[PDB]
Design a protein around this ligand. Structure first.
Ligand SMILES: [Mg+2]
Ligand SMILES: [Zn+2]
Lengths: 190, 163, 52, 198
RNA sequence: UGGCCAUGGAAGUCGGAAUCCGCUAAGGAGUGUGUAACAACUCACCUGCCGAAUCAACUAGCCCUGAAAAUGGAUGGCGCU
């Protein structure tokens, strides 16, 4: 039934400054801005506290599937804050039993050529979502590093190269190859 | 025994179980047997000699190899000694219906059974061991015409005699 | 051939999955019900058979 | 079940508290059932070992029972993976018996290193097997006629260092077990007085 | 504790009659994996952290799966949330 009220709080840290034009949070700090719109979620994004310390999200007269959004907005702002402060760092290790998936970034991070996958002549070119920047790591041999602020864009770009390197018309239990996400960490930990 | 073929002393033990008689299906030697100088048919005959005249209703066989001479012994299992102290002995081939008569008393005979346990059990003496071996019996069914379960609780004997 | 921790990482993505008994949908291994509206969230699931 | 048992557990701990005026709080830690049985067999005659929960948070009810103070000091120290050792002999002697028993228990991959672990120069005890597992990190190993021999006494892991996975597995194959401990002593109860392993 | 029946092997584990005690904090004469058979692994009782409800089995409403036909098509039509 209609729950008379639900809410939550999102305690912003003193480094970051968040601001909300209505229902369109914009979060800025060390690394950069991250806007996100929630016109489509239907909530009261109050912002309270001197020093602007916490973001509150009411949701009045919600039914079960309307009250399910409350936390997911709150959480999306949490990631947004993390992105601004620390920034996300997805690491993905290449795997093969023969053909050593030859990776090479191109423009800056943007492009990812993925040559010699399974001994295929086809060279996979994979763009990155605006903001994300791939880079071939050191201190680990067959391993990529995708860094960026907007987690959504990062993890999508990770998937983009994960599904790029897919095996068709074979026993995938046998043929375990491709560039898989190994670790979802941050650019700096504190 | 490590590099090629050398006996420095050889008092090597390995645990076989079951051995009423010779056994056609055997499986006595191989693997462990031939490498280590113990043969096959002679080792089976020596195993029959030790585990001959009781027990003929399953036995245990620790095999201490002294270079070529095996020393077979009967280390006691609780249910085996109960089946040894049954209404003997209709050995093999009828038989047949089956080996589960299980009305053979043993009141003070199980006192010897709890005594012959190789310490073990992490016990507070026979008071608790009496409860264990009085239930190990799948067949026996305790005294004259009793049950096992809760008659065990009211024991009035052999607390100080079993150490 | 292939580094063990690296292998188990690629298993996680390819082979550590539940499968729907109605519609063959490949599902995360924690799954109790299916994804698929086509089979009505069946719940008859089985694990994906391991390579011997 | 679990109402009569819970009452029976209260009766166990109170009777042990009434019988013995001295208790030894020991941390269980990464411990086996085989370890606990070995400790039971060693400390059979004198001591009685126990392993509890937040119904050891119940010494309060013993202290309530028209008699005891001093058990109020023991309430904060029932935290972590804790078990008791009730006994009547002595304190410093029992501490030495607990320290002397212990067990090997092979490498925990990821956890800290208590002492400077080494790899003595000796054969593994294998045929022509993977030397690449040993030489991946930084170890000098040769195939000196079949057996994989390590050619130098080298320190892999130092004090307060994290143990890697591949080096932990190689130590397990070699049967080298310096890691783990058995059980630790945090605090003591001796006829009212509290000590901290001293 | 190679428990008993079963030897073809089932020491918990193709099956079945059993089916209790000890230590117990507590572990079934065993849910499975797998083994010729073990092993090895996996599945209570209890803690450490976290911080109020949690969870099971039925039942009946709408909705959905179940639900495949041949000229292009019919809640009468347009449409409708
Ligand atoms: Mg094919
Ligand atoms: Zn389905």
């Amino acid at each position: 039934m209609k729950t008379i009220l639900s809410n939550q709080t999102v305690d912003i840290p003193e480094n970051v400054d968040i601001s909300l034009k209505g229902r369109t949070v914009i979060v800025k700090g060390p690394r950069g801005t991250l806007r996100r719109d929630f016109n489509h979620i239907n909530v009261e994004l109050s912002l309270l506290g001197k020093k602007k310390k916490r973001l509150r999200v009411d949701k009045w007269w919600g039914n079960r599937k309307e009250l399910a959004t409350v936390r997911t907005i709150c959480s999306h702002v949490q990631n947004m804050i993390k992105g601004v402060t620390l920034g996300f760092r997805y690491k993905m290790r290449s795997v093969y039993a023969h053909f050593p998936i030859n990776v090479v970034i191109q423009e800056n991070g943007s492009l990812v050529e993925i040559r010699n996958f399974l001994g295929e002549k086809y060279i996979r070119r994979v763009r990155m979502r605006p903001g994300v920047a791939c880079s071939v790591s050191q201190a680990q041999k067959d391993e990529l590093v995708l860094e960026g602020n907007d987690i959504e864009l990062v993890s999508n770009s990770a998937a983009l190269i994960q599904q790029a390197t897919t095996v068709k018309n074979k026993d995938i239990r046998k043929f375990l190859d491709g560039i898989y996400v190994s670790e979802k960490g941050t650019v700096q930990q504190a | 025994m490590p590099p090629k073929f050398d006996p420095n002393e050889i008092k090597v033990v390995y645990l076989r179980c079951t051995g009423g008689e010779v056994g056609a299906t055997s499986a006595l030697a191989p693997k462990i047997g031939p490498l280590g100088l113990s043969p096959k048919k002679v080792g089976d005959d020596i195993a029959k000699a030790t585990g001959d005249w009781k027990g003929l209703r399953i036995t245990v066989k620790l095999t201490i190899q002294n270079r070529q001479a095996q020393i077979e012994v009967v280390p006691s299992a609780s249910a085996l000694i109960i089946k040894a102290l049954k209404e003997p002995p209709r050995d093999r081939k009828k038989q047949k219906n089956i080996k589960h008569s299980g009305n053979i008393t043993f009141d003070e005979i199980v006192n010897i059974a709890r005594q012959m346990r190789h310490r073990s059990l992490a016990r507070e003496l026979s008071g608790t061991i009496k409860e264990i071996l009085g239930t190990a019996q799948s067949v026996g069914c305790n005294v004259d015409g009793r049950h096992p379960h809760d008659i065990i609780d009211d024991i009035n004997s052999g607390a100080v005699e079993c150490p | 051939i292939i580094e063990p921790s690296l292998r188990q990482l690629a298993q996680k993505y390819n082979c550590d999955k539940m499968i729907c008994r109605k519609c063959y949908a490949r599902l995360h291994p924690r799954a109790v019900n299916c994804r698929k509206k086509k089979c009505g969230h069946t719940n008859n699931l089985r694990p994906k058979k391991k390579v011997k | 079940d679990r109402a009569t048992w819970k009452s029976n557990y209260f009766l166990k701990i109170i009777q042990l508290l009434d019988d013995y005026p001295k208790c030894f709080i020991v941390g269980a830690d990464n411990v086996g059932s085989k370890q606990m049985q070995q400790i039971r067999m060693s400390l059979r005659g004198k001591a009685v070992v126990l392993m509890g929960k937040n119904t050891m948070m119940r010494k309060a009810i013993r202290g309530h029972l028209e008699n005891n103070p001093a058990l109020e000091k023991l309430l904060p120290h029932i935290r972590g993976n804790v078990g008791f050792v009730f006994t009547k002999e002595d304190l410093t002697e029992i501490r030495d018996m607990l320290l002397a028993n212990k067990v090997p228990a092979a490498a925990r991959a990821g956890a800290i290193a208590p002492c400077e672990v080494t790899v003595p120069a000796q054969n593994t005890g294998l045929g022509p097997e993977k030397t690449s597992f040993f030489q991946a990190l930084g170890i000098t190993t040769k195939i000196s006629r079949g057996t994989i021999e390590i050619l130098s006494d080298v320190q892999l892991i130092k004090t307060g260092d994290k143990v890697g996975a591949s080096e932990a597995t190689l130590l397990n194959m070699l049967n080298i077990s310096p890691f783990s401990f058995g059980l630790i002593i945090q605090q003591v109860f001796d006829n009212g007085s509290i000590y901290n392993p001293e």
